[PDB]
Amino acid sequence: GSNMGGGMNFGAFSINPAMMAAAQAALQSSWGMMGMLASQQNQSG
Amino acid sequence: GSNMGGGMNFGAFSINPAMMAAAQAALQSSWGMMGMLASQQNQSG
Amino acid sequence: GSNMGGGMNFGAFSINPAMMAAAQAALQSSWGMMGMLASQQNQSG
Amino acid sequence: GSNMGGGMNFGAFSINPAMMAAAQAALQSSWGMMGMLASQQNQSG
Amino acid sequence: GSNMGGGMNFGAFSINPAMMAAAQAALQSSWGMMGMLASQQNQSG
Amino acid sequence: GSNMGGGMNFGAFSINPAMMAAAQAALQSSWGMMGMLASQQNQSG
Amino acid sequence: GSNMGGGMNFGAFSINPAMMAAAQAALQSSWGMMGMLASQQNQSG
Amino acid sequence: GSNMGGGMNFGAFSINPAMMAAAQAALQSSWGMMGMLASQQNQSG
Amino acid sequence: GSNMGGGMNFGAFSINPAMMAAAQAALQSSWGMMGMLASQQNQSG
Amino acid sequence: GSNMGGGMNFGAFSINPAMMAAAQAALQSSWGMMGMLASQQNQSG
Amino acid sequence: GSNMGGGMNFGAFSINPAMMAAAQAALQSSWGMMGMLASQQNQSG
Amino acid sequence: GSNMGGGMNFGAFSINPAMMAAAQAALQSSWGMMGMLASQQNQSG
Amino acid sequence: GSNMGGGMNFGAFSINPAMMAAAQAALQSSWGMMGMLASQQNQSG
Amino acid sequence: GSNMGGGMNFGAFSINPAMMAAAQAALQSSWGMMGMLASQQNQSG
Amino acid sequence: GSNMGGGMNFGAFSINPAMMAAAQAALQSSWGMMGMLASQQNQSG
Amino acid sequence: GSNMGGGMNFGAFSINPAMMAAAQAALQSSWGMMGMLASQQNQSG
Amino acid sequence: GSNMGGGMNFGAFSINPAMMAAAQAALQSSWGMMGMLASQQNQSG
Amino acid sequence: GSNMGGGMNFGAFSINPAMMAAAQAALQSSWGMMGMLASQQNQSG
C-alpha cells in the first residue's frame, strides 16, 4: 500500500510529451495535475 | 491499496501530448486535472 | 482498492492531445477535469 | 473498488482531442468535467 | 508500503519529454504535478 | 517501507528528457513535481 | 456592537459534533455556514 | 466594539468536536464557516 | 475595540478537539473558519 | 484597542487539542482559521 | 494598543496540544492560523 | 503600545505542547501561526 | 482590433468614484464588472 | 492589435478614485473588474 | 501588437487615486483588476 | 511587438497615487492588477 | 520586440506615488501588479 | 530585442516616490511588481 502527501501548485506547468508506441503489448497514458494508473500486462511466451 | 493526498492547482497547465499507437494490444488515454485508469492486458502466446 | 484526495483547479487547463490507434485491440479515451476508466483487454494467442 | 475525492473547477478547460481508430476491436470516448467508462474487450485467438 | 511527504510548487515547471517505445512489451506514461503508476509486466520465455 | 520528507519548490524547473526504448521488455515514465512508480518486470529464460 | 467581515467558502466542510448536556441550566446549538445566538442565562443562588 | 476582517476558504475543513457538559450552568455551541455567540451567565452565590 | 486583518485559507484544516466540562459555571464552543464569542460569567461568592 | 495584520494560509493545519476542564468557573473554546473571544470571569470570594 | 504585522504561512502546521485545567478559576483556548482572546479574571479573597 | 514586524513562514511547524494547570487562578492558551492574548488576573489576599 | 482574456471575480469590489466634469466637450462613464465604451470627440478650432 | 491574458481575482478590491475634469476637451471613465475604452479626441487649432 | 501573460490576484488591492485634470485636452481613467484604453489625442497648433 | 510573462499576486497591494495634471495636452490613468494603455499625443507647433 | 519573464509576488507592496504634471505635453500613469503603456508624444517646434 | 529573466518576490516592497514634472515635454509613470513602458518623444527645434 503506497502513501503520498498532498501538494498545491499555483505555477504554470507546460508539459509537451509526444508519443508513438508499437510493440507486441503497448499502453500510452498522459495526464496533468493528478492521476493513478495500475497496468499489469502479462504476455506468456 | 494506493493512498494519495489532495492538491489544488490555480496555475495554467498546458499539456500538448500527441499519440499514435499500433501494437498487437494498444490502449491510449489522455486526461487533465484528475483521473484513475486500471488497464490489465494479458495476451497469451 | 485505490484511494485519491480531492483537488480544486481555478486555472486554465489547455490539453491538445491528438490520437490515431490501429492495433489488434485498440481503445482511446480523452477527458478533462475528472474521470475513471477500467479497461481489461485479454487477447488469447 | 476505486475511491476518488471531489473537485471544483472554475477555470476554462479547452480540450482539443482529435481521433481516428481502426483495429480488430476499437472503442473511442471523449468527455468534459466528469465521466466513468468500464470497457472490457476480450478477443479470443 | 512506501511513504512520501507533501510538497507545494509555485514555480513554472516546463517538461518536454518526447517518446517512441517499440519492444516485445512496452508501456509509456507522462504526467505533471502528481501521479502514481504500478505496472508489473511478466513475460515468460 | 521507504520514508521521504516533504519539500516545497518555488523555482522554475525545466526538464527536457527525450527517450526511445526498444528491448524485449521496455517501460518509459516521465513526471514533474511528484510521482511514485513501482514496476517489477520478471522475464523467464 | 460586534463587527464581522463577509466570507465565501467553496470547500467541503464536514463537522461531526456529538453532544450530551445535563446541568442545572443547559443550552445546545449546532449550525453550518452562518448563525447568530445570544443566550444570557442568569441563575440566582 | 470588536472589528474583524473578511476571509474566503476554498479548502476542506474537517472539524470533529465531541462534547459532554454537566455543571451548575452549562452552554454548548458548535458551528462551521461563520457564527457570532454572546452568552453572559451570572450565577449569584 | 479590537481590530483584526482579513485572511484567506485554501488549505485543508483538520481540527479534532474533544471536550468534557463540569464546573460550577461551564461554557463550551467549537468553530471552523470564522467566529466571535463574548462570554462574561460573574459568579458571586 | 488591539491591532493585527491580515494573513493567508494555503497550508494544511492539523490541530488535535483534547480538553477536560472542571473548576469553580470553567470556559472552553476551540477554533480554526480565525476567531475573537472576550471572556471576563469575576468570582468574588 | 498593541500593533502586529501581517504574515502568510503556506507550510503544514501540526499542533497537538492536549489540556486538563481544574482551578478555582479556569479558562482553556486552542486555535489555528489567527485569533484574539482578552480574558481578565479577578477573584477577590 | 507594542510594535511587531510581519513574517511569512513556508516551513512545516510541528508544535506538541501538552498542558495540565490546577491553581487558585489558571488560564491555558495554545495557538499556531498568529494570535494576541491579553489576560490580567488580580487575586486579592 | 484589441484582444482581452476572460476573468472571474468572487471578491467584494467597492468602487466609490465621484465626478464633476465641465469642459467645452465632456463625457462621464462609470461601470462595474464589465463594459466597452468607444467615444471619439473631434472639436474643430 | 493588443493581446492580454485572462485573470481571476477572489480578493476585495477597494478603489476610491474621485475626479473633477474641466478642459477644452474632457473625458472621465471609472470601472471595476473589466473594461475596454477607445477614446480618440482630435482638437484642431 | 502587444502581448501580455495572464495573472490571478487573491489579495486585497486598495487603490486610492484622486484626480483633477484641466488642460487644452484632458482625459481621466481609473480601473481595478483589468482594462485596455487606447487614447490618441492630436491637437494641431 | 512587446512580450510579457504571467504573474500571480496573493499579497495586499495598497497604491495611493493622487494626481493633478494641467498642460496644453494632459492624460491621467490609474489602475490595479492589470492594464494596457496606448496613448500617442502629437501636438504640432 | 521586448521579452520579459513571469513573476509571482505574495508580499505586501505599498506604493505611495503622488504626482502633479504641468508641461506643453503631459502624461501621468500609475499602476500596481502589471501594466503595459506605449506613449509616443511628438511636439513639432 | 531585450531579454529578461523571471523573478518571484515574497518580501514587502514599500516604494514612496513623489513627483512634479513641468517641461516643454513631460511624462510621469509609477508602477509596482511588473510593467513595460516605451515612450519616444521627439521635439523638433
Numbering used by the authors:
A (entry chain L), B (entry chain I), C (entry chain F), D (entry chain C), E (entry chain O), F (entry chain R), ...: 304 to 348
Published text:
Here, we report a cryo-electron microscopy (cryo-EM)-based structural characterization of TDP-43 fibrils obtained from the full-length protein.
Morphology-2 show a width of 10.4 ± 0.6 nm (n = 50), while the fibril cross-overs are hardly visible and no crossover distance could be measured. The 3D maps reached spatial resolutions of 3.76 Å (Morphology-1a) and 4.05 Å (Morphology-1b), based on the 0.143 Fourier Shell Correlation (FSC) criterion. Morphology-2, finally, contains three structurally equal, in-register fibril protein stacks, and the fibril is C3-symmetrical. All fibril proteins contain arch that is formed by residues Ala328-Ala341, while residues Gly304-Ala326 are wrapped around this arch.
